[PDB]
Symmetry: C2
Subunit: 81 residues, 2 copies
C-alpha cells in the first residue's frame, strides 16, 4: 500500500503528458528499494508511429523525473478512442 | 533518507506556486506514517498581508495535494528580496 501510492503517482504523472489518452496498463515492482515498471499508454489512432514513440519517451522522462525511485520504466502505446 | 525524498517533494511543490520566492524553512517529522510539517515561504515585501495569506493557503493545498502522507502542514510567510 506504499506501492499503491507509488502507482498513483505514476499514473498521475503519465496522464499529464500531452498526447496520453489514459494509462491502459501499469505493472510496478520493487527490486530492492528501486522500482521497475512496465506501462502502456493510450494514444490517438491517428498519431503517427513516430509521434506515439515521442509521447512514450515524454512519458518516460515525466514519470522518472517525478518519481525518483524508478530505475527502469518501459512505456508502449496502443490506439485508444 | 526516505524523509529527504519527502522534503524534496515538499520544497519542489511549494516552489511551483505563484508568489513563492523560495522555501525559507521546512521542518518535517513523522508522526507514525503521517507527516507533520512547518514551513516558511519567501514573498514579495510589497505583497499585501492578505496576498501573503493567500499564497500560504495555496502552498498548503498544492503541497498536501501532491504529498498524500502529510496530515498537518503550517505555512507562514516572510519578506524576501
Ligand atoms: Ni527516437
Ligand atoms: Ni483567509
Amino acid at each position: 500500500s506504499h506501492m499503491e501510492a507509488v502507482q498513483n503517482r505514476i499514473v498521475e504523472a503519465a496522464e499529464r503528458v500531452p498526447g496520453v489518452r489514459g494509462v491502459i496498463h501499469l505493472r510496478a515492482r520493487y527490486v530492492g528499494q528501486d522500482i521497475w515498471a512496465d506501462m502502456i499508454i493510450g494514444v490517438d489512432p491517428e498519431n503517427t508511429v513516430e509521434q506515439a514513440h515521442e509521447i512514450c519517451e515524454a512519458v518516460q522522462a515525466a514519470v522518472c523525473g517525478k518519481i525518483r525511485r524508478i530505475e527502469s520504466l518501459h512505456v508502449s502505446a496502443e490506439a485508444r478512442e
